[PDB]
Amino acid sequence: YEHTATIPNVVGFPYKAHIERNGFSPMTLQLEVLGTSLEPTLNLEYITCEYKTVVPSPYIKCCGTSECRSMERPDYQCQVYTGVYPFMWGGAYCFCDTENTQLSEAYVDRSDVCKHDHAAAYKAHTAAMKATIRISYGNLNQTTTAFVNGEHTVTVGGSRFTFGPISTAWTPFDNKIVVYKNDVYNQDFPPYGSGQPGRFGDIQSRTVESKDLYANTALKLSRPSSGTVHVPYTQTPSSFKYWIKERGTSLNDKAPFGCVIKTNPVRAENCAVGNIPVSMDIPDTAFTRVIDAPAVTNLECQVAVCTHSSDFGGIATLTFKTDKPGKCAVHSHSNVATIQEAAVDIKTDGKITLHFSTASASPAFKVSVCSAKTTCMAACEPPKDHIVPYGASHNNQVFPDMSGTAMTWVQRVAGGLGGLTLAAVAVLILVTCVTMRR
Amino acid sequence: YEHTATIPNVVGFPYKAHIERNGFSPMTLQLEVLGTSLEPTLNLEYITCEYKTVVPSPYIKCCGTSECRSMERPDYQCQVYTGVYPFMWGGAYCFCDTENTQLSEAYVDRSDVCKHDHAAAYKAHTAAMKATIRISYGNLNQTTTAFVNGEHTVTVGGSRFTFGPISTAWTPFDNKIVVYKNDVYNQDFPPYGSGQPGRFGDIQSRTVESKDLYANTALKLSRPSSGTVHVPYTQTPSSFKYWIKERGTSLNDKAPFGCVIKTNPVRAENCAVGNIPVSMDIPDTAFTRVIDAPAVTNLECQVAVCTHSSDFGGIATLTFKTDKPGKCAVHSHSNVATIQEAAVDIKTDGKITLHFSTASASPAFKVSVCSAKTTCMAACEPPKDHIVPYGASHNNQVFPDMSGTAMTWVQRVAGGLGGLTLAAVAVLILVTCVTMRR
Amino acid sequence: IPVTEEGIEYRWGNNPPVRLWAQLTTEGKPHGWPHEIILYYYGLYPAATIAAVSAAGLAVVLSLLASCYMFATARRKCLTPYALTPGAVVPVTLGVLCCAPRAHA
Ligand SMILES: *[C@@H]1O[C@H](CO)[C@@H](O[C@@H]2O[C@H](CO)[C@@H](O[C@@H]3O[C@H](CO[C@H]4O[C@H](CO)[C@@H](O)[C@H](O)[C@@H]4O)[C@@H](O)[C@H](O[C@H]4O[C@H](CO)[C@@H](O)[C@H](O)[C@@H]4O)[C@@H]3O)[C@H](O)[C@H]2NC(C)=O)[C@H](O)[C@H]1NC(C)=O
Ligand SMILES: *[C@@H]1O[C@H](CO)[C@@H](O[C@@H]2O[C@H](CO)[C@@H](O[C@@H]3O[C@H](CO[C@H]4O[C@H](CO)[C@@H](O)[C@H](O)[C@@H]4O)[C@@H](O)[C@H](O[C@H]4O[C@H](CO)[C@@H](O)[C@H](O)[C@@H]4O)[C@@H]3O)[C@H](O)[C@H]2NC(C)=O)[C@H](O)[C@H]1NC(C)=O
C-alpha cells in the first residue's frame, strides 16, 4: 500500500499521519524527528598556522669578504654589509679597524605545532542533509537514519520508507568557511596566493603536510648597530594571534535559525527550516480487517477546559455505543488541534478521555475514532505565564471558525444592515416598475 | 601594468596579445594553452563487485527432527524439509525409512577480490577546471598550471597572472558517473537501497571496506530430488558480469567537443569549448623605451600568393625606411588574418617577408611594426586539396569588405540603379512646381 | 564518412585514433566574371547563397519599376492640362515627353 505525507522540520514534534483504505480499520502513524545534520561539500583551499622565523647565528669574516647566496626558501632575504667592529666580550674580535664584513641571513617557514592547531578554509557549494527519524506504529518502534534526498531508501521492520528532497536549499554558511578548532567562521577569506600581512592568511599551505609554503609577512632586515654582535630585523606580527583575540564571536553565536555549529566533520546540526516529504510502503500484514475491529456507533463529544497553553492544555470527553472491547486509533481532521497519544483502548461503557491542544479562542476540529466521526466546539481561555521553557506543540493558527462568540456578533451586524440594504432596494424595484408605466 | 585578454579555448594554438602604453615601445605577447582537464566534485555512493553464493554442507539428522536458527545475514534462507532417504555411496545412510529432517541453508556476501576491481558510482554537480599555459615574451619561456577561476594567482617571471572564470558552464558528465576500469558510462544508476536482480547494482555496499552489504538476488531454495545428498538453489545470475559485456561504448567514444575521458581522479581532459579571460600584471622592467627602439617610417605592403590553406598560406613582401638596427614587434589588428613569429628583426634596407593565414577571397588587414601602421590587400585563390591532417590556424571571417572584385560589381549596380530611382524624385520636384504655379 | 568542417576522429581495430579536418576548397572561380563568381560562393554555403541572391534580385526589379512609376506620374502632370481645353500640344514638349496625343488625337 502507498501513502505520502509532509512533516514540519522542528525537532521533538510528534506528527501523526492517517491511513484509510477500504476493507480495513483506519490506522495512524507517528513520525518524530530526533536530529538533523547538514554537512557542506568541503574542499580545503588552504590551511593556516602561526609562523616561526629562524635567524641563525650571524657569520662574520675578519679579513676577507663574503657574498650573497640566493637560496630557495619562502621569504628568504640575506644581504651583506661593509666593515663592522664586533667587540664581543673581552677586547675586540677581528683585531682590525676595517675590512671585516658580517653576512646576515633570515627566512620563515611553518610552525612546529602546525599539525596540531590550525585554521582550515573550505568552500560550501552543496550540502547533504541527514536525519534520525523514529517510526511508531502498532507494537513497533525503530529508529533509522537516511540522507534526506528523494532517492535514498531505508527499511523498518517489514516496511520501507524514503524521504523526499528538502523544500528549500538554504545554508547557514556561505560559500566561504574558516575552521580553527571549534568555531567555523562565515567570513570571506582572502584566496590562495594573495595573502596579506597582519590580516588572516599571512602564511598559507595547500594541505596539512606538503612543500610549497606561501608567505609575505614583510620581513625586513636592517643594519647592525655599534660594537655588539646581534642580527636585528623587523617584521609585521603574527596574524593568527590577532585572529585568536580579534575574533568577535563564532558562528555558533550568530547563526540564523538557531543551529549549533560543530566542527570536526564540519557540520551544521539541528536547524529549523522548511518541511520534509515522506513516502510509505506499509504492507498488508499490518492492518486489521474490519470484522475484527470493534464497531463504534453514535459519537458525541463535549469539551471541558481548553486553555491556550503551549502544551496539551485541553481535555474532551466522548460517548458512544460500542458492541465489543478493543483498540481504536483516533485522529484529528483539522490543523487547529492535535490530539495526543493516538491509540485509545475502547471498553464496554461509552466514555473515553482525550488530550488536545489548540492555539485559538474557538476550535472546530472533528474526531474519528473507528470509521465514525463527530465535531467538537469549545470556548477557550488564554493562559497566564509569559515566558515558558519549552517550545510549541500546536500549529500557529488564530482564527475562530464560523460560529464562535467573537464571530456571532459579526453575523448579527452583517445580516442586520445587509438585510436592510436589500429592503431599500426592494422599495426602488417597486417604484421603478409601477410609476415608470403609469 | 594591467591588461585583459580573452584567449580561445583551442588546445595547441598560439595567441598574440599586444600591449601599448605611453613612452615605451609596443610589445607583443604569446600565450599558449597546452592541456585543459576539468573534474567534477565526486563522492562515492556505492561500490559494486561480483557476488559469491556461499552454501555449506547440508545437515541430516535421522534419529529425530531439527529447527532453523534464524540468524541475520544479507539473504539468509533457511528451510527444513520432511522425511528423506539419502542413499549415500555404500548402501543406505541413516538406517530408517521416514521421520528424518534435513536443514538446508544458504546466503550471499561480497566477492573475494572486490577491493581490486570494482565499479563505483559518483556524482557530478560542480566542476573545477585546471589548465597549463606556456607564457612567452622576450627571453622568458615558462609553463605553469593554475585553476581557471577568478581567485588563483600564479607568478611566472616577475609578473602575476590570473585566469578568469569560464564563459560556459558545460560538462559532458550529466549528473552521474559509473567507472569500472578506464571508462565512464553516462548512466542513471539506481540509488542505494533499490537494487534490481540482473540489472546493474544488485550488490551495493557504501564503500570498499565497510560493512552493511545490500543484496536482493532472489535466492530461492528447493528440496532435494529423491535420493541424493545435494542442495538445489535457483537465483538470477550476476548482474556485474552482464555489465562487462553488455556495455556498448563508454562516454569516451561519444563525447561532444572532442573530449577524451580518463578515470583515476575521474576527469575529462582537452575539451575545446568557450574562451578564457585572463589578467596580466607585467611590470615596467620588461618593456623597452622609445629612445632605444628603432624609429621606422614609410610603410608599404604587397602580397604574391595568398593560398586559402589552413596553415600559413600567403607571403607578404613589406618595405620600410629605418635609421638604426634594432628590434620590432609586428601584429595585425583585425580578425581576418593572423600573423606568425610576432617579433621579427630589422635591417637598414627594407626587405622583410611575413607569413599570414587568412580565410577569405579578399582580406584587408592592417599591420603595425614599431608603432608604424599600414594596410594590406590580397587576391587569394583556393587550394587543390580536400582532407587535411592538421587543424586550422585562422579565425573564420568570410567577408570581402569594401574593395574586392566581389564588392566592385555590387557598388556599380547599386550605385547605378539607385542613381535613377532618386533621379525620378528630382523630376517629381522639377516639373510639379511649374504646373502648380501656372 | 562525412567530414564536414570540424573534422572527425576514427579508430580502426586497435590502432591509435586519427583526426582529419576538412579543407575549404571549392569548384568555382574567384576574381573573374560576375557569372562565375556565383559558383565560387556556391561550393561555399550552397543553401545560404540562394536566399542571398534573391534579396539581391528582388531589390532590383522593385527599384526599377519605382523609377518608371515616378516617370509616368510626372509625365501625366505635364500632358493633362493641355488636354482639357481645346488647344495645341506644343511640340517643344514632344521631343521631351513623347506624348500619346501625336497626330489626330
Ligand atoms: C517505543 O520506543 C521506545 C524505545 O526506546 C520505548 O519507550 C521508551 O522507553 C524509554 C525507557 O524504557 C524512555 O526513555 C526514558 O524514559 C524515562 C522515564 O521518564 C520518566 O521520567 C522523566 C524524567 O523525570 C519524566 O519527565 C517522565 O514523565 C517519566 O516520569 C526518562 O526518565 C529518561 O530520561 C533520560 O533522558 C533524559 C533526557 O531526555 C535525561 O535527562 C535522563 O537522565 C535520562 O537519561 C528517558 O526519557 C523513552 O522516553 C521511551 N520512548 C518513547 C515513549 O517514545 C517503548 O518500549 C516503545 N514502545 C513499545 C510499545 O514497545
Ligand atoms: C621555448 O620556446 C620555444 C619556442 O617558443 C619552444 O621550442 C620548441 O619546442 C618544441 C617542443 O619542445 C620543438 O618541437 C620539437 O622539434 C624537434 C625537431 O623538429 C624537427 O623535426 C620535426 C619532426 O619531423 C619537424 O616537424 C620540424 O620541422 C623539424 O624538422 C622534434 O624532433 C621534436 O619531436 C620530439 O618530441 C616529440 C613529442 O614532443 C616526439 O614524438 C619526437 O619523437 C621527438 O622526441 C619536437 O617536435 C620545437 O622545435 C622548438 N622550437 C621552435 C622554434 O618551435 C620551447 O619548447 C620552449 N621551452 C623551453 C626551451 O623550455
Coordinates of C-alpha atoms in Angstrom, one line a residue, chain B:
Chain B
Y1 CA 50.8 47.5 -15.8
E2 CA 47.4 45.8 -16.2
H3 CA 45.9 44.2 -19.3
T4 CA 43.0 41.9 -20.1
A5 CA 42.6 39.5 -23.0
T6 CA 40.3 36.6 -24.0
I7 CA 42.3 33.6 -25.4
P8 CA 40.3 31.0 -27.3
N9 CA 40.0 27.5 -25.7
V10 CA 41.7 25.6 -28.6
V11 CA 44.3 23.2 -27.4
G12 CA 47.7 23.8 -29.1
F13 CA 47.1 27.2 -30.7
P14 CA 49.2 30.3 -30.2
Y15 CA 47.5 33.6 -29.2
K16 CA 49.1 37.1 -29.6
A17 CA 48.3 39.7 -27.1
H18 CA 49.6 43.2 -27.7
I19 CA 50.5 45.9 -25.1
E20 CA 50.8 49.6 -25.9
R21 CA 51.4 52.2 -23.2
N22 CA 52.8 55.7 -23.0
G23 CA 56.5 56.2 -23.7
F24 CA 57.6 52.7 -24.2
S25 CA 57.8 50.5 -27.3
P26 CA 54.9 48.4 -28.4
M27 CA 55.3 44.9 -27.0
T28 CA 53.6 41.6 -28.1
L29 CA 52.9 38.5 -26.0
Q30 CA 52.4 34.9 -26.9
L31 CA 50.2 32.8 -24.6
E32 CA 49.6 29.2 -25.5
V33 CA 47.5 26.6 -23.7
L34 CA 48.7 23.0 -23.5
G35 CA 46.2 20.9 -21.6
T36 CA 42.8 21.5 -20.0
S37 CA 41.3 19.0 -17.6
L38 CA 38.1 19.5 -15.7
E39 CA 36.9 17.2 -12.9
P40 CA 33.6 17.2 -11.0
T41 CA 33.3 17.0 -7.3
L42 CA 32.8 13.3 -6.8
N43 CA 31.5 11.5 -3.8
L44 CA 31.1 7.7 -3.9
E45 CA 27.6 6.5 -3.3
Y46 CA 28.1 2.7 -3.6
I47 CA 30.6 0.0 -4.8
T48 CA 29.6 -3.0 -6.9
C49 CA 31.5 -6.2 -7.4
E50 CA 30.5 -9.8 -8.2
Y51 CA 28.8 -11.8 -5.5
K52 CA 29.7 -15.2 -4.1
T53 CA 26.9 -17.5 -3.0
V54 CA 28.2 -19.4 0.0
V55 CA 26.4 -22.6 1.0
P56 CA 27.8 -25.2 3.5
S57 CA 27.4 -28.9 3.5
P58 CA 23.8 -30.0 4.3
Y59 CA 22.8 -31.3 7.7
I60 CA 20.8 -34.6 8.0
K61 CA 19.6 -35.8 11.5
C62 CA 17.9 -39.2 11.2
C63 CA 17.0 -40.0 14.8
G64 CA 14.7 -37.1 15.2
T65 CA 13.9 -33.6 13.9
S66 CA 15.6 -30.2 13.9
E67 CA 14.7 -26.5 13.7
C68 CA 16.2 -23.4 12.0
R69 CA 18.2 -20.9 13.9
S70 CA 17.1 -17.7 12.1
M71 CA 20.2 -15.6 12.2
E72 CA 20.7 -12.4 10.2
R73 CA 22.9 -12.4 7.0
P74 CA 22.0 -10.5 3.8
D75 CA 19.9 -13.2 2.1
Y76 CA 19.8 -15.9 4.8
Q77 CA 17.4 -18.5 3.6
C78 CA 16.6 -21.5 5.9
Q79 CA 14.0 -24.1 5.2
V80 CA 13.8 -27.6 6.8
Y81 CA 12.4 -30.5 4.8
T82 CA 10.5 -33.6 5.9
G83 CA 11.3 -37.3 5.6
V84 CA 14.0 -38.2 3.1
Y85 CA 16.3 -41.1 2.3
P86 CA 19.8 -40.0 1.4
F87 CA 21.3 -43.1 -0.5
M88 CA 25.0 -42.4 0.2
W89 CA 27.6 -44.5 -1.7
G90 CA 27.7 -47.6 0.4
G91 CA 24.1 -48.8 0.9
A92 CA 21.7 -46.6 2.8
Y93 CA 22.7 -43.7 5.0
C94 CA 20.7 -43.4 8.3
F95 CA 19.1 -46.8 8.9
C96 CA 15.4 -45.9 8.8
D97 CA 12.8 -45.0 6.2
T98 CA 11.0 -41.9 7.4
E99 CA 11.0 -39.4 10.4
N100 CA 14.2 -37.7 9.4
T101 CA 14.6 -34.0 8.7
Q102 CA 17.1 -32.1 6.7
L103 CA 18.2 -28.5 7.4
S104 CA 19.3 -26.6 4.3
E105 CA 20.7 -23.0 4.4
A106 CA 22.5 -20.6 2.1
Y107 CA 23.2 -16.9 1.9
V108 CA 25.2 -14.3 0.0
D109 CA 28.1 -11.9 0.6
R110 CA 30.6 -9.8 -1.2
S111 CA 33.2 -11.2 -3.6
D112 CA 36.8 -12.1 -2.6
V113 CA 38.7 -9.8 -4.9
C114 CA 36.4 -6.8 -4.5
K115 CA 38.9 -4.2 -3.5
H116 CA 41.0 -4.8 -6.6
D117 CA 38.4 -4.4 -9.4
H118 CA 35.1 -2.7 -8.6
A119 CA 32.6 -0.4 -10.1
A120 CA 32.0 3.0 -8.5
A121 CA 29.1 5.4 -8.7
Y122 CA 29.9 9.0 -8.2
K123 CA 28.0 12.3 -8.6
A124 CA 28.8 15.3 -10.8
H125 CA 27.2 18.6 -9.8
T126 CA 30.0 21.1 -9.9
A127 CA 33.3 21.2 -11.7
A128 CA 36.9 22.5 -11.2
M129 CA 38.9 23.3 -14.3
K130 CA 42.7 23.4 -14.4
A131 CA 45.0 24.3 -17.2
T132 CA 48.6 24.5 -18.4
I133 CA 49.8 27.6 -20.2
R134 CA 53.1 28.5 -22.0
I135 CA 53.9 32.1 -21.5
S136 CA 56.4 33.7 -23.9
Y137 CA 57.9 37.2 -24.2
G138 CA 61.4 38.4 -24.9
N139 CA 63.7 35.9 -23.3
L140 CA 61.1 34.5 -20.9
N141 CA 59.8 31.0 -21.7
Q142 CA 57.9 29.1 -18.9
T143 CA 55.0 26.8 -18.3
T144 CA 52.7 26.8 -15.3
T145 CA 49.4 25.4 -14.1
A146 CA 46.6 27.2 -12.4
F147 CA 42.9 26.8 -11.5
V148 CA 40.6 28.6 -14.0
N149 CA 38.6 30.8 -11.7
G150 CA 38.9 34.4 -10.6
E151 CA 40.8 33.6 -7.3
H152 CA 44.0 31.8 -8.2
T153 CA 47.2 33.7 -9.0
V154 CA 50.5 32.5 -10.5
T155 CA 53.8 34.3 -10.8
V156 CA 56.0 33.5 -13.8
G157 CA 58.9 35.9 -14.4
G158 CA 58.1 38.8 -12.1
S159 CA 54.5 39.3 -13.1
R160 CA 51.3 37.9 -11.5
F161 CA 48.8 36.4 -13.9
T162 CA 45.2 35.4 -13.1
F163 CA 42.9 33.4 -15.4
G164 CA 39.3 34.4 -15.2
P165 CA 36.1 32.3 -15.0
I166 CA 34.9 30.2 -17.9
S167 CA 32.3 31.6 -20.2
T168 CA 30.2 28.5 -20.4
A169 CA 29.3 26.0 -17.6
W170 CA 29.1 22.9 -19.8
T171 CA 30.1 19.4 -18.5
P172 CA 29.8 16.2 -20.6
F173 CA 29.1 14.3 -17.4
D174 CA 25.3 14.6 -16.9
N175 CA 25.0 14.2 -13.2
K176 CA 26.3 10.8 -12.6
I177 CA 29.4 8.7 -13.2
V178 CA 30.0 4.9 -13.4
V179 CA 33.7 3.9 -13.5
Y180 CA 34.9 0.3 -13.9
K181 CA 38.5 0.4 -15.1
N182 CA 39.2 3.0 -17.7
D183 CA 35.8 4.2 -18.8
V184 CA 32.8 6.3 -17.7
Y185 CA 29.3 5.2 -18.7
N186 CA 26.9 8.1 -18.7
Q187 CA 24.3 6.3 -16.6
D188 CA 21.3 6.8 -14.3
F189 CA 22.1 4.0 -11.9
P190 CA 19.6 3.0 -9.1
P191 CA 20.1 4.6 -5.7
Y192 CA 21.4 2.9 -2.6
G193 CA 18.7 0.6 -1.4
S194 CA 16.9 -0.1 -4.7
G195 CA 18.9 -2.9 -6.3
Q196 CA 17.3 -4.9 -9.0
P197 CA 18.3 -8.5 -9.9
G198 CA 20.2 -8.7 -13.2
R199 CA 20.4 -5.0 -13.9
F200 CA 23.3 -3.0 -12.6
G201 CA 23.7 -2.6 -8.8
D202 CA 22.4 -5.7 -7.2
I203 CA 25.3 -5.6 -4.8
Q204 CA 25.6 -2.1 -3.2
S205 CA 28.0 -1.5 -0.3
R206 CA 28.6 2.0 0.8
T207 CA 32.4 1.9 0.4
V208 CA 35.1 -0.7 -0.2
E209 CA 36.0 -1.9 3.3
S210 CA 32.8 -1.1 5.3
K211 CA 30.0 -3.4 6.4
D212 CA 26.3 -3.3 5.6
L213 CA 26.1 -5.2 2.4
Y214 CA 22.9 -4.9 0.4
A215 CA 21.6 -7.6 -2.0
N216 CA 18.4 -8.9 -3.5
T217 CA 19.2 -11.6 -6.0
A218 CA 16.1 -13.8 -5.4
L219 CA 17.8 -16.7 -3.6
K220 CA 15.1 -19.4 -3.6
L221 CA 15.6 -23.0 -2.4
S222 CA 14.0 -26.3 -3.4
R223 CA 14.0 -29.8 -1.9
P224 CA 16.5 -32.5 -3.0
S225 CA 15.1 -34.7 -5.6
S226 CA 14.8 -38.3 -4.3
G227 CA 18.0 -40.0 -3.1
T228 CA 21.0 -37.7 -3.5
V229 CA 22.8 -35.7 -0.8
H230 CA 22.8 -32.4 -2.6
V231 CA 21.3 -28.9 -2.2
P232 CA 19.5 -27.1 -5.0
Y233 CA 19.2 -23.4 -5.3
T234 CA 18.0 -21.1 -8.0
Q235 CA 18.7 -17.4 -8.3
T236 CA 19.2 -14.9 -11.1
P237 CA 22.8 -14.6 -12.3
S238 CA 25.5 -12.0 -11.7
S239 CA 24.5 -8.5 -12.9
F240 CA 28.0 -7.3 -12.8
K241 CA 29.2 -9.7 -15.4
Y242 CA 26.2 -8.7 -17.6
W243 CA 27.5 -5.2 -17.5
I244 CA 31.1 -6.1 -18.5
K245 CA 29.9 -7.5 -21.8
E246 CA 26.6 -5.7 -22.5
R247 CA 28.3 -2.3 -22.3
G248 CA 28.2 -0.7 -25.7
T249 CA 30.7 2.1 -25.5
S250 CA 31.8 4.5 -22.8
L251 CA 31.3 8.2 -22.8
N252 CA 34.8 8.5 -24.1
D253 CA 33.7 7.2 -27.5
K254 CA 30.7 9.6 -27.8
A255 CA 31.8 12.8 -26.0
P256 CA 30.8 16.1 -27.8
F257 CA 33.6 18.5 -28.1
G258 CA 36.5 16.2 -29.0
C259 CA 36.9 15.2 -25.3
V260 CA 38.8 12.2 -24.0
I261 CA 37.9 10.7 -20.7
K262 CA 40.4 9.3 -18.2
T263 CA 39.4 7.6 -14.9
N264 CA 41.5 7.6 -11.8
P265 CA 40.6 11.0 -10.3
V266 CA 37.7 10.9 -12.7
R267 CA 38.1 13.7 -15.3
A268 CA 37.8 14.7 -18.9
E269 CA 40.8 16.4 -20.4
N270 CA 41.4 18.5 -23.5
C271 CA 37.9 19.8 -24.2
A272 CA 37.7 22.6 -26.7
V273 CA 34.7 24.9 -25.7
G274 CA 34.3 28.5 -24.7
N275 CA 37.1 31.0 -24.0
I276 CA 39.2 32.1 -21.1
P277 CA 39.5 35.7 -19.9
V278 CA 42.9 36.5 -18.5
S279 CA 44.5 39.2 -16.4
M280 CA 48.1 40.4 -16.8
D281 CA 50.4 42.1 -14.3
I282 CA 53.7 42.7 -16.3
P283 CA 56.0 45.1 -14.5
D284 CA 57.8 48.0 -16.2
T285 CA 61.2 46.2 -16.0
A286 CA 60.3 44.2 -19.1
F287 CA 59.5 46.9 -21.7
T288 CA 61.8 49.0 -23.8
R289 CA 61.9 52.7 -24.1
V290 CA 61.2 54.5 -27.3
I291 CA 64.6 56.1 -27.2
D292 CA 66.3 52.7 -27.8
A293 CA 63.7 51.4 -30.2
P294 CA 64.4 52.0 -33.9
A295 CA 62.1 54.5 -35.5
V296 CA 60.5 53.0 -38.6
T297 CA 58.8 55.0 -41.3
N298 CA 57.3 54.8 -44.9
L299 CA 55.4 51.5 -44.8
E300 CA 54.3 49.5 -47.8
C301 CA 52.6 46.2 -48.2
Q302 CA 52.1 43.8 -51.2
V303 CA 51.4 40.1 -51.5
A304 CA 52.2 37.4 -54.0
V305 CA 50.3 34.2 -53.4
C306 CA 47.6 34.1 -50.6
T307 CA 46.5 30.4 -50.6
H308 CA 43.4 29.5 -48.6
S309 CA 45.4 26.7 -46.9
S310 CA 44.9 26.2 -43.2
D311 CA 48.5 26.6 -42.0
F312 CA 50.1 29.9 -43.2
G313 CA 49.3 30.1 -46.9
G314 CA 50.4 33.6 -48.1
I315 CA 53.6 35.6 -48.3
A316 CA 53.8 39.4 -47.8
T317 CA 56.7 41.5 -49.0
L318 CA 56.9 44.6 -46.9
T319 CA 59.3 47.6 -47.1
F320 CA 60.1 50.5 -44.8
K321 CA 62.7 53.2 -44.0
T322 CA 64.7 52.8 -40.8
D323 CA 67.7 54.6 -39.3
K324 CA 69.2 52.3 -36.7
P325 CA 69.4 48.4 -36.4
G326 CA 67.2 47.2 -33.6
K327 CA 64.1 45.0 -32.9
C328 CA 60.4 45.4 -33.7
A329 CA 57.2 43.5 -32.8
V330 CA 54.7 43.1 -35.6
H331 CA 50.9 42.5 -35.1
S332 CA 47.7 42.7 -37.0
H333 CA 44.5 44.4 -35.7
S334 CA 41.7 42.5 -37.5
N335 CA 40.4 39.0 -37.1
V336 CA 40.5 38.3 -40.9
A337 CA 44.2 37.3 -40.8
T338 CA 46.7 36.1 -38.2
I339 CA 50.5 36.8 -38.2
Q340 CA 53.3 34.4 -37.3
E341 CA 56.5 34.9 -35.3
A342 CA 55.5 38.2 -33.8
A343 CA 58.9 39.8 -33.2
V344 CA 60.9 39.9 -36.5
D345 CA 64.2 41.7 -36.7
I346 CA 65.1 44.7 -38.8
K347 CA 67.6 45.7 -41.5
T348 CA 68.7 49.0 -43.0
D349 CA 67.2 48.3 -46.3
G350 CA 63.5 47.5 -46.1
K351 CA 63.1 43.8 -47.2
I352 CA 61.3 41.5 -44.8
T353 CA 58.6 39.0 -45.5
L354 CA 55.6 37.8 -43.4
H355 CA 53.5 34.6 -43.2
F356 CA 49.8 35.4 -42.8
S357 CA 46.9 32.9 -42.9
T358 CA 43.6 34.3 -44.0
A359 CA 40.3 32.5 -45.0
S360 CA 38.5 34.8 -47.4
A361 CA 38.6 35.8 -51.1
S362 CA 39.9 39.3 -50.4
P363 CA 41.3 40.1 -46.9
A364 CA 42.0 43.6 -45.8
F365 CA 44.0 43.9 -42.5
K366 CA 46.5 46.3 -41.0
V367 CA 50.0 45.8 -39.7
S368 CA 51.9 47.7 -37.0
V369 CA 55.7 47.1 -36.9
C370 CA 57.0 49.6 -34.3
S371 CA 54.1 52.0 -33.9
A372 CA 54.1 52.4 -37.6
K373 CA 51.0 51.4 -39.4
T374 CA 49.8 50.4 -42.9
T375 CA 47.2 48.1 -44.6
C376 CA 47.4 45.1 -46.9
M377 CA 45.4 43.6 -49.7
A378 CA 45.3 40.2 -51.5
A379 CA 43.7 38.3 -54.4
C380 CA 43.5 34.9 -52.9
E381 CA 43.0 31.5 -54.6
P382 CA 41.6 28.1 -53.4
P383 CA 43.9 25.2 -52.8
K384 CA 43.8 21.8 -54.6
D385 CA 43.2 19.5 -51.6
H386 CA 40.2 18.1 -49.8
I387 CA 41.3 16.4 -46.5
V388 CA 44.0 17.8 -44.2
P389 CA 45.5 16.0 -41.2
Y390 CA 46.4 19.1 -39.2
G391 CA 43.9 21.7 -37.9
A392 CA 43.1 25.3 -38.8
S393 CA 45.1 28.3 -37.8
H394 CA 42.8 31.1 -38.7
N395 CA 39.7 32.8 -37.3
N396 CA 36.8 32.3 -39.6
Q397 CA 35.9 35.6 -41.3
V398 CA 34.4 35.3 -44.8
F399 CA 33.6 38.8 -45.9
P400 CA 35.3 40.7 -48.8
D401 CA 34.6 44.0 -47.2
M402 CA 34.9 47.2 -49.4
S403 CA 37.4 46.9 -52.3
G404 CA 37.5 43.5 -53.9
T405 CA 36.2 42.2 -57.2
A406 CA 33.0 40.8 -55.5
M407 CA 32.4 44.3 -54.0
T408 CA 33.1 46.4 -57.1
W409 CA 30.2 44.9 -59.2
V410 CA 27.9 45.4 -56.2
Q411 CA 28.8 49.1 -56.0
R412 CA 28.3 49.7 -59.7
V413 CA 24.8 48.1 -59.8
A414 CA 23.5 49.6 -56.6
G415 CA 25.3 52.9 -57.4
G416 CA 23.9 52.8 -60.9
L417 CA 20.3 51.6 -60.2
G418 CA 19.9 53.8 -57.1
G419 CA 21.0 56.9 -59.1
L420 CA 18.0 56.5 -61.4
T421 CA 15.4 56.0 -58.6
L422 CA 16.4 59.2 -56.8
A423 CA 16.6 61.0 -60.2
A424 CA 12.9 60.5 -60.7
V425 CA 12.4 62.1 -57.3
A426 CA 14.3 65.1 -58.7
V427 CA 11.8 65.1 -61.7
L428 CA 9.0 64.9 -59.2
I429 CA 10.2 68.2 -57.8
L430 CA 11.3 69.7 -61.1
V431 CA 8.0 69.6 -63.0
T432 CA 5.3 69.7 -60.4
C433 CA 6.1 73.2 -59.1
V434 CA 5.9 74.7 -62.6
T435 CA 2.5 73.1 -63.3
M436 CA 1.0 74.2 -60.0
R437 CA 2.3 77.8 -60.2
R438 CA 1.0 78.2 -63.8

